[PDB]
Amino acid sequence: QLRYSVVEESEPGTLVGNVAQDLGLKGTDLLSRRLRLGSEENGRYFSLSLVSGALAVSQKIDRESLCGASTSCLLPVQVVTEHPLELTRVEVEILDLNDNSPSFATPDREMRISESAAPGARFPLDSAQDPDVGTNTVSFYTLSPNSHFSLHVKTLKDGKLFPELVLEQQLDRETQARHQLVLTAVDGGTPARSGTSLISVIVLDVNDNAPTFQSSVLRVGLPENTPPGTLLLRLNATDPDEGTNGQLDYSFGDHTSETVKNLFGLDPSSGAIHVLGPVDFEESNFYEIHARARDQGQPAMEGHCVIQVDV
Ligand SMILES: *[C@@H]1O[C@H](CO)[C@@H](O[C@@H]2O[C@H](CO)[C@@H](O)[C@H](O)[C@H]2NC(C)=O)[C@H](O)[C@H]1NC(C)=O
Ligand SMILES: *[C@H]1O[C@H](CO)[C@@H](O)[C@H](O)[C@@H]1O
Ligand SMILES: *[C@H]1O[C@H](CO)[C@@H](O)[C@H](O)[C@@H]1O
Ligand SMILES: [Ca+2]
Numbered sequence: 262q263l264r265y266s267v268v269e270e271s272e273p274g275t276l277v278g279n280v281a282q283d284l285g286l287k288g289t290d291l292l293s294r295r296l297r298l299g300s301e302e303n304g305r306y307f308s309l310s311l312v313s314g315a316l317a318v319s320q321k322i323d324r325e326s327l328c329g330a331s332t333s334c335l336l337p338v339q340v341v342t343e344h345p346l347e348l349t350r351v352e353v354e355i356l357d358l359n360d361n362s363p364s365f366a367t368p369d370r371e372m373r374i375s376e377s378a379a380p381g382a383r384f385p386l387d388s389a390q391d392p393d394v395g396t397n398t399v400s401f402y403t404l405s406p407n408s409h410f411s412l413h414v415k416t417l418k419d420g421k422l423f424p425e426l427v428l429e430q431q432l433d434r435e436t437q438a439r440h441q442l443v444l445t446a447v448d449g450g451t452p453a454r455s456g457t458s459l460i461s462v463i464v465l466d467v468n469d470n471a472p473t474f475q476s477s478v479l480r481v482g483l484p485e486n487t488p489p490g491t492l493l494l495r496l497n498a499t500d501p502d503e504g505t506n507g508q509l510d511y512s513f514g515d516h517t518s519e520t521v522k523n524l525f526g527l528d529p530s531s532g533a534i535h536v537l538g539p540v541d542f543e544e545s546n547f548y549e550i551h552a553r554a555r556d557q558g559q560p561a562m563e564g565h566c567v568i569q570v571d572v
Protein backbone atom coordinates (compact mmCIF):
# COMPACT_ATOMS: atom_id res chain seq x y z
CA GLN A 262 0.00 0.00 0.00
CA LEU A 263 2.71 2.51 0.98
CA ARG A 264 5.64 3.65 -1.19
CA TYR A 265 8.32 6.02 0.10
CA SER A 266 11.70 7.25 -1.14
CA VAL A 267 14.89 8.37 0.57
CA VAL A 268 18.27 9.58 -0.67
CA GLU A 269 21.21 7.22 -0.20
CA GLU A 270 23.82 7.95 2.52
CA SER A 271 21.32 10.12 4.39
CA GLU A 272 22.11 10.59 8.08
CA PRO A 273 20.20 8.53 10.71
CA GLY A 274 16.89 10.17 11.63
CA THR A 275 16.09 11.35 8.12
CA LEU A 276 12.35 11.28 7.38
CA VAL A 277 11.29 8.57 4.93
CA GLY A 278 7.51 8.91 5.24
CA ASN A 279 4.72 9.52 7.74
CA VAL A 280 3.31 6.00 8.07
CA ALA A 281 0.82 6.85 10.83
CA GLN A 282 -0.62 9.72 8.81
CA ASP A 283 -0.97 7.52 5.72
CA LEU A 284 -2.66 4.76 7.72
CA GLY A 285 -5.13 7.08 9.43
CA LEU A 286 -3.62 6.72 12.90
CA LYS A 287 -3.28 9.52 15.46
CA GLY A 288 -2.31 10.02 19.10
CA THR A 289 -3.22 7.12 21.38
CA ASP A 290 -3.88 4.93 18.33
CA LEU A 291 -0.13 4.48 17.87
CA LEU A 292 0.18 2.70 21.21
CA SER A 293 -3.30 1.17 21.33
CA ARG A 294 -2.86 -0.56 17.98
CA ARG A 295 0.78 -1.42 18.77
CA LEU A 296 2.38 0.09 15.65
CA ARG A 297 5.42 -1.98 14.69
CA LEU A 298 7.90 -3.06 12.05
CA GLY A 299 8.00 -6.61 10.73
CA SER A 300 10.49 -9.14 12.06
CA GLU A 301 12.26 -9.01 8.68
CA GLU A 302 15.89 -7.93 8.31
CA ASN A 303 14.91 -4.69 6.55
CA GLY A 304 13.87 -3.27 9.92
CA ARG A 305 17.57 -2.83 10.65
CA TYR A 306 17.70 0.10 8.22
CA PHE A 307 14.58 1.91 9.44
CA SER A 308 12.97 3.17 12.64
CA LEU A 309 9.29 3.79 13.30
CA SER A 310 8.79 6.63 15.77
CA LEU A 311 6.61 5.88 18.78
CA VAL A 312 5.75 9.59 18.91
CA SER A 313 5.75 10.75 15.29
CA GLY A 314 4.58 7.51 13.73
CA ALA A 315 6.95 8.53 10.94
CA LEU A 316 9.33 6.10 9.26
CA ALA A 317 12.97 7.17 9.53
CA VAL A 318 16.41 5.94 8.53
CA SER A 319 18.06 3.89 11.28
CA GLN A 320 21.56 3.80 9.78
CA LYS A 321 23.52 5.35 6.90
CA ILE A 322 22.39 3.37 3.84
CA ASP A 323 24.74 2.60 0.95
CA ARG A 324 22.77 1.71 -2.16
CA GLU A 325 26.00 0.71 -3.89
CA SER A 326 26.46 -2.05 -1.30
CA LEU A 327 22.77 -2.96 -1.56
CA CYS A 328 21.59 -2.90 -5.17
CA GLY A 329 24.90 -2.58 -7.00
CA ALA A 330 24.12 -1.68 -10.60
CA SER A 331 20.34 -2.11 -10.42
CA THR A 332 18.25 0.62 -12.04
CA SER A 333 16.14 0.82 -8.89
CA CYS A 334 16.91 -0.05 -5.27
CA LEU A 335 13.79 -1.24 -3.42
CA LEU A 336 13.84 -2.01 0.30
CA PRO A 337 10.62 -3.71 1.46
CA VAL A 338 9.57 -3.39 5.10
CA GLN A 339 6.40 -4.53 6.85
CA VAL A 340 4.21 -2.40 9.13
CA VAL A 341 2.09 -4.14 11.77
CA THR A 342 -0.95 -2.75 13.60
CA GLU A 343 -3.26 -4.57 16.01
CA HIS A 344 -6.84 -4.34 17.29
CA PRO A 345 -7.76 -5.03 14.57
CA LEU A 346 -4.58 -6.61 13.22
CA GLU A 347 -3.77 -5.63 9.65
CA LEU A 348 -0.49 -5.58 7.74
CA THR A 349 0.89 -2.98 5.36
CA ARG A 350 3.67 -3.60 2.85
CA VAL A 351 5.98 -0.61 2.56
CA GLU A 352 8.45 -0.13 -0.28
CA VAL A 353 11.22 2.36 0.38
CA GLU A 354 13.23 3.31 -2.70
CA ILE A 355 16.87 4.22 -2.17
CA LEU A 356 17.76 7.02 -4.58
CA ASP A 357 21.26 7.16 -6.06
CA LEU A 358 23.65 9.84 -4.84
CA ASN A 359 26.71 10.80 -6.89
CA ASP A 360 29.06 10.01 -4.03
CA ASN A 361 31.47 7.74 -5.89
CA SER A 362 34.34 9.00 -8.03
CA PRO A 363 35.72 7.45 -11.24
CA SER A 364 38.59 5.05 -10.45
CA PHE A 365 41.35 3.38 -12.46
CA ALA A 366 43.06 0.05 -11.79
CA THR A 367 46.49 1.66 -11.52
CA PRO A 368 47.64 5.29 -11.08
CA ASP A 369 50.48 4.67 -13.53
CA ARG A 370 50.23 2.50 -16.64
CA GLU A 371 53.20 1.69 -18.86
CA MET A 372 52.77 1.14 -22.60
CA ARG A 373 55.70 -0.19 -24.63
CA ILE A 374 55.12 0.72 -28.28
CA SER A 375 57.67 0.02 -31.03
CA GLU A 376 59.08 3.00 -32.93
CA SER A 377 58.03 1.43 -36.23
CA ALA A 378 54.36 1.60 -35.23
CA ALA A 379 52.21 2.45 -38.24
CA PRO A 380 49.88 5.46 -38.01
CA GLY A 381 46.35 4.31 -37.19
CA ALA A 382 47.52 1.56 -34.85
CA ARG A 383 44.97 1.27 -32.05
CA PHE A 384 45.99 0.76 -28.43
CA PRO A 385 43.14 -0.14 -26.02
CA LEU A 386 43.11 1.55 -22.61
CA ASP A 387 42.00 0.26 -19.21
CA SER A 388 38.44 1.45 -18.58
CA ALA A 389 37.58 3.42 -15.44
CA GLN A 390 34.85 2.49 -12.95
CA ASP A 391 32.11 4.34 -11.05
CA PRO A 392 29.68 2.20 -8.99
CA ASP A 393 27.03 4.94 -9.22
CA VAL A 394 24.11 4.52 -11.64
CA GLY A 395 22.53 6.66 -14.36
CA THR A 396 24.55 9.73 -15.27
CA ASN A 397 26.37 9.47 -11.95
CA THR A 398 28.72 6.93 -13.53
CA VAL A 399 31.56 7.51 -16.02
CA SER A 400 30.39 9.96 -18.69
CA PHE A 401 33.42 10.74 -20.85
CA TYR A 402 37.21 10.54 -21.08
CA THR A 403 39.82 13.20 -21.82
CA LEU A 404 43.42 12.87 -23.01
CA SER A 405 46.05 15.50 -22.27
CA PRO A 406 47.16 17.63 -25.26
CA ASN A 407 49.94 15.89 -27.17
CA SER A 408 51.27 15.56 -30.70
CA HIS A 409 51.28 11.84 -31.52
CA PHE A 410 48.29 10.13 -29.92
CA SER A 411 44.55 10.62 -30.18
CA LEU A 412 41.88 9.52 -27.71
CA HIS A 413 38.94 7.57 -29.09
CA VAL A 414 35.98 6.42 -27.03
CA LYS A 415 33.23 4.31 -28.59
CA THR A 416 30.01 3.21 -26.90
CA LEU A 417 29.45 -0.54 -27.07
CA LYS A 418 26.14 -2.34 -27.60
CA ASP A 419 26.40 -2.99 -23.87
CA GLY A 420 26.42 0.75 -23.23
CA LYS A 421 29.75 0.78 -21.42
CA LEU A 422 32.55 3.08 -22.57
CA PHE A 423 35.66 1.71 -24.26
CA PRO A 424 38.64 4.10 -24.54
CA GLU A 425 41.63 3.50 -26.82
CA LEU A 426 44.71 5.38 -28.04
CA VAL A 427 45.20 6.11 -31.72
CA LEU A 428 48.61 6.91 -33.21
CA GLU A 429 48.25 10.05 -35.34
CA GLN A 430 51.92 10.70 -36.08
CA GLN A 431 54.76 8.19 -36.44
CA LEU A 432 56.97 7.90 -33.34
CA ASP A 433 60.73 8.50 -33.22
CA ARG A 434 62.83 7.33 -30.27
CA GLU A 435 65.73 9.50 -31.43
CA THR A 436 63.53 12.54 -30.80
CA GLN A 437 61.84 11.53 -27.56
CA ALA A 438 61.87 8.03 -26.07
CA ARG A 439 58.99 8.74 -23.69
CA HIS A 440 55.53 10.24 -24.01
CA GLN A 441 53.68 10.89 -20.76
CA LEU A 442 49.93 11.21 -21.25
CA VAL A 443 47.16 11.83 -18.75
CA LEU A 444 43.91 9.90 -19.10
CA THR A 445 41.03 11.42 -17.17
CA ALA A 446 37.62 9.83 -16.59
CA VAL A 447 34.73 12.14 -15.70
CA ASP A 448 31.21 11.22 -14.56
CA GLY A 449 28.04 13.12 -15.46
CA GLY A 450 27.37 14.49 -11.99
CA THR A 451 27.01 18.14 -11.04
CA PRO A 452 29.61 18.93 -9.90
CA ALA A 453 31.45 16.26 -11.88
CA ARG A 454 33.85 13.91 -10.10
CA SER A 455 36.92 12.40 -11.76
CA GLY A 456 39.98 10.16 -11.66
CA THR A 457 43.23 9.99 -13.62
CA SER A 458 45.83 7.55 -14.94
CA LEU A 459 49.37 8.53 -15.93
CA ILE A 460 50.23 6.73 -19.16
CA SER A 461 53.96 6.62 -19.85
CA VAL A 462 54.51 5.51 -23.44
CA ILE A 463 57.90 3.85 -23.70
CA VAL A 464 59.11 4.15 -27.29
CA LEU A 465 61.04 0.97 -28.12
CA ASP A 466 64.14 1.36 -30.29
CA VAL A 467 64.27 0.33 -33.95
CA ASN A 468 67.48 0.11 -35.98
CA ASP A 469 66.37 2.74 -38.50
CA ASN A 470 69.53 4.86 -38.33
CA ALA A 471 72.72 3.98 -40.20
CA PRO A 472 76.16 5.14 -38.96
CA THR A 473 77.46 8.51 -40.19
CA PHE A 474 81.01 9.88 -40.42
CA GLN A 475 81.80 13.50 -39.54
CA SER A 476 82.67 14.18 -43.18
CA SER A 477 81.73 12.45 -46.44
CA VAL A 478 85.29 12.72 -47.76
CA LEU A 479 88.36 13.74 -45.76
CA ARG A 480 91.73 14.34 -47.41
CA VAL A 481 94.99 14.18 -45.44
CA GLY A 482 98.71 14.49 -46.17
CA LEU A 483 101.59 12.21 -45.22
CA PRO A 484 105.38 12.71 -45.50
CA GLU A 485 107.51 10.26 -47.49
CA ASN A 486 109.53 9.42 -44.37
CA THR A 487 106.64 8.55 -42.05
CA PRO A 488 107.82 5.91 -39.53
CA PRO A 489 105.74 2.75 -38.87
CA GLY A 490 103.38 2.88 -35.90
CA THR A 491 102.29 6.48 -36.45
CA LEU A 492 98.52 6.97 -36.30
CA LEU A 493 97.31 8.70 -39.46
CA LEU A 494 93.75 9.44 -38.33
CA ARG A 495 90.94 8.25 -36.07
CA LEU A 496 87.64 7.40 -37.76
CA ASN A 497 84.54 8.95 -36.21
CA ALA A 498 81.07 7.57 -36.96
CA THR A 499 77.97 8.14 -34.84
CA ASP A 500 74.82 6.02 -34.55
CA PRO A 501 71.86 7.62 -32.73
CA ASP A 502 70.15 4.26 -32.12
CA GLU A 503 70.10 2.61 -28.71
CA GLY A 504 72.12 -0.29 -27.31
CA THR A 505 73.43 -2.77 -29.86
CA ASN A 506 71.98 -0.90 -32.83
CA GLY A 507 74.00 2.16 -31.83
CA GLN A 508 77.36 0.45 -31.43
CA LEU A 509 79.53 -0.07 -34.49
CA ASP A 510 82.70 -1.81 -35.69
CA TYR A 511 84.84 -0.26 -38.44
CA SER A 512 86.02 -2.03 -41.59
CA PHE A 513 87.55 -1.43 -45.03
CA GLY A 514 85.70 -1.95 -48.31
CA ASP A 515 85.26 -5.52 -49.52
CA HIS A 516 87.41 -4.82 -52.59
CA THR A 517 90.26 -2.75 -51.19
CA SER A 518 93.56 -3.46 -52.94
CA GLU A 519 95.97 -5.83 -51.19
CA THR A 520 98.59 -3.08 -51.22
CA VAL A 521 96.38 -0.71 -49.22
CA LYS A 522 95.39 -3.67 -47.05
CA ASN A 523 98.99 -4.36 -46.02
CA LEU A 524 100.25 -0.77 -45.85
CA PHE A 525 97.33 0.77 -43.93
CA GLY A 526 96.20 -0.81 -40.67
CA LEU A 527 93.00 -0.15 -38.77
CA ASP A 528 91.18 -0.97 -35.54
CA PRO A 529 87.63 -2.42 -35.71
CA SER A 530 86.93 -0.71 -32.37
CA SER A 531 88.64 2.67 -32.05
CA GLY A 532 88.77 3.32 -35.79
CA ALA A 533 92.34 4.58 -35.54
CA ILE A 534 94.47 4.16 -38.65
CA HIS A 535 98.11 3.18 -38.31
CA VAL A 536 100.71 2.62 -41.02
CA LEU A 537 102.73 -0.62 -40.97
CA GLY A 538 104.90 -0.82 -44.09
CA PRO A 539 107.13 1.68 -45.95
CA VAL A 540 105.72 4.63 -47.92
CA ASP A 541 107.77 5.91 -50.87
CA PHE A 542 106.53 8.89 -52.88
CA GLU A 543 108.05 7.39 -56.03
CA GLU A 544 105.94 4.23 -55.86
CA SER A 545 102.59 6.01 -55.48
CA ASN A 546 101.57 9.54 -54.50
CA PHE A 547 97.85 9.07 -53.82
CA TYR A 548 95.56 6.56 -52.10
CA GLU A 549 91.77 6.40 -51.85
CA ILE A 550 90.56 3.99 -49.17
CA HIS A 551 86.94 2.95 -48.65
CA ALA A 552 86.17 3.23 -44.93
CA ARG A 553 82.98 1.66 -43.57
CA ALA A 554 81.21 1.70 -40.20
CA ARG A 555 78.73 -1.09 -39.49
CA ASP A 556 76.26 -1.26 -36.60
CA GLN A 557 75.56 -4.41 -34.59
CA GLY A 558 71.91 -5.16 -35.35
CA GLN A 559 69.47 -7.14 -37.47
CA PRO A 560 68.90 -5.91 -40.05
CA ALA A 561 72.33 -4.29 -39.81
CA MET A 562 73.04 -0.92 -41.38
CA GLU A 563 76.27 0.69 -42.53
CA GLY A 564 77.68 4.12 -43.33
CA HIS A 565 80.51 4.75 -45.76
CA CYS A 566 83.48 7.09 -46.06
CA VAL A 567 86.36 7.79 -48.44
CA ILE A 568 89.77 8.79 -47.11
CA GLN A 569 92.26 10.46 -49.44
CA VAL A 570 95.89 10.01 -48.44
CA ASP A 571 98.44 12.23 -50.19
CA VAL A 572 102.16 11.42 -50.01
C1 LIG B 1 82.69 12.68 -33.61
O1 LIG B 1 81.59 13.34 -34.22
C2 LIG B 1 80.55 13.67 -33.29
C3 LIG B 1 79.42 14.26 -34.10
O2 LIG B 1 79.65 14.13 -35.49
C4 LIG B 1 81.08 14.61 -32.21
O3 LIG B 1 80.03 14.83 -31.27
C5 LIG B 1 80.00 16.07 -30.53
O4 LIG B 1 78.90 15.92 -29.60
C6 LIG B 1 78.69 17.03 -28.72
C7 LIG B 1 77.59 16.63 -27.77
O5 LIG B 1 77.43 17.59 -26.73
C8 LIG B 1 78.34 18.26 -29.55
O6 LIG B 1 78.14 19.37 -28.69
C9 LIG B 1 79.48 18.55 -30.52
O7 LIG B 1 79.14 19.66 -31.34
C10 LIG B 1 79.78 17.34 -31.40
N1 LIG B 1 80.93 17.61 -32.24
C11 LIG B 1 80.85 17.82 -33.56
C12 LIG B 1 82.14 18.09 -34.27
O8 LIG B 1 79.77 17.81 -34.15
C13 LIG B 1 82.31 14.02 -31.54
O9 LIG B 1 82.91 14.98 -30.66
C14 LIG B 1 83.34 13.61 -32.59
N2 LIG B 1 84.49 12.98 -31.96
C15 LIG B 1 85.74 13.43 -32.11
C16 LIG B 1 86.81 12.66 -31.40
O10 LIG B 1 86.00 14.42 -32.79
C1 LIG C 1 38.68 15.52 -12.69
O1 LIG C 1 37.78 16.22 -13.52
C2 LIG C 1 36.73 16.94 -12.85
C3 LIG C 1 35.90 17.62 -13.94
O2 LIG C 1 36.77 18.00 -15.00
C4 LIG C 1 37.36 17.94 -11.88
O3 LIG C 1 36.33 18.57 -11.15
C5 LIG C 1 38.31 17.22 -10.91
O4 LIG C 1 38.89 18.16 -10.00
C6 LIG C 1 39.37 16.41 -11.67
O5 LIG C 1 40.20 17.37 -12.32
C1 LIG D 1 46.01 11.97 -12.20
O1 LIG D 1 46.15 12.67 -10.98
C2 LIG D 1 46.20 11.85 -9.79
C3 LIG D 1 46.30 12.79 -8.61
O2 LIG D 1 47.30 13.77 -8.90
C4 LIG D 1 47.39 10.89 -9.89
O3 LIG D 1 47.41 10.04 -8.76
C5 LIG D 1 47.28 10.04 -11.17
O4 LIG D 1 48.41 9.18 -11.27
C6 LIG D 1 47.12 10.92 -12.41
O5 LIG D 1 48.39 11.55 -12.60
CA1 LIG E 1 27.49 5.19 -1.85
Ligand SMILES: [Ca+2]
Binds near residue numbers: 269357359
Ligand atom coordinates in the same frame (compact mmCIF):
# COMPACT_ATOMS: atom_id res chain seq x y z
CA1 LIG F 1 25.82 6.29 -5.18
Ligand SMILES: [Ca+2]
Binds near residue numbers: 399454
Ligand atom coordinates in the same frame (compact mmCIF):
# COMPACT_ATOMS: atom_id res chain seq x y z
CA1 LIG G 1 29.96 9.15 -9.63
Ligand SMILES: [Ca+2]
Binds near residue numbers: 433434469470
Ligand atom coordinates in the same frame (compact mmCIF):
# COMPACT_ATOMS: atom_id res chain seq x y z
CA1 LIG H 1 63.78 6.57 -35.60
Ligand SMILES: [Ca+2]
Binds near residue numbers: 435468469503
Ligand atom coordinates in the same frame (compact mmCIF):
# COMPACT_ATOMS: atom_id res chain seq x y z
CA1 LIG I 1 65.99 3.99 -33.56
Ligand SMILES: [Ca+2]
Binds near residue numbers: 468469501506507558
Ligand atom coordinates in the same frame (compact mmCIF):
# COMPACT_ATOMS: atom_id res chain seq x y z
CA1 LIG J 1 72.12 1.80 -36.24
